[PDB]
Amino acid sequence: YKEGICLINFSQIALSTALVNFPDKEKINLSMVRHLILNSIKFNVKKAKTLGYTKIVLCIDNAKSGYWRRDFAYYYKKTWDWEGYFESSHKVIDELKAYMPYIVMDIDKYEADDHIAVLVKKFSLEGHKILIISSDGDFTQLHKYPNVKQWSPMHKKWVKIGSAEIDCMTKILKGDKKDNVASVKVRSDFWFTRVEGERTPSMKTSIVEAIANDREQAKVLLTESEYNRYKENLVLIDFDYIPDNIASNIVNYYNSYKLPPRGKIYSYFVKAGLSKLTNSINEF
C-alpha cells in the first residue's frame, strides 16, 4: 500500500552533533566523522522505523555553487576545525551513496530544506504518512499537509504548532537575518549593503497576522514598495513558491536513485574499520 516515509534534515543533524561532540581546537579526522555520522544514522533510522516510517531519505545541503534562490536574490545567504569536518563529511557522504540503503538527496545549489519541503508535499498528497526528523521551525509550513509529523532529534520531542502561517508570514514580512532575507520595510539586499546608521523599521504584529490570515491584505496594508518586497521574500521563505523546475528536478532525482544492495554494508563496515558495527547492520 503506502509505506511510511521519513525525511531527515541530515546536514543539520550531522553538523550540530559534530559541534557538540568534537571538542574545540582539536583537529577532526575522517574516522571521527565516520563514526559520528553512522551512529547518528543508526539512532535516527531506529526512531523512524519503530514509529512506522520504514523508508529513510537523507537530505543534504549542497552549496558548492551557491543556491538556486540566489538567481532571484544575489544576497541570499551571503575555534572549531570546520575544514576538517566538511572535508571528512563530504567523503563519508559519498560512502553513504555507495553502500548504505538510503536515498541521499544531494543536488548542487539545492538545500536540504528544498528536498524535504518538496518530497514531503509530494508523498503526503500521495497517501504516505510522513516523518520529518529535524528541529528547524521552518518545516512547520509542512504540517498543514495530512499525516505529517516532525521529530526533534536534539530535544527528543515532537514538534507541534494556524500558528505556522504567522511564523511563515513573520519571516516574509520582517525577514530572516540568518539567510540575509531582509524586511519589506527596507531594500532587498539590506543585510548585504547595510551601512551603520541603518536600522530596519518595525513591523506591527496586527499587520503581520492580518496578512497571515488573508494574504490579499498584502495589497491593502502594504505600500507598493513593501508589496514588491513581499513578493520577493515569498520565493525566499515560502516553500510553496519553490519554482516548478526546482521541485521537478528534486523529484526526478529521487525517482532516478538506485539503492545499493544491503550486501554492500557489511564489506564497507569492515573496510572502514568499523568491525564493532557489523553486528548492528540490522539496525541500519
Ligand SMILES: [Mg+2]
Ligand atoms: Mg528557507
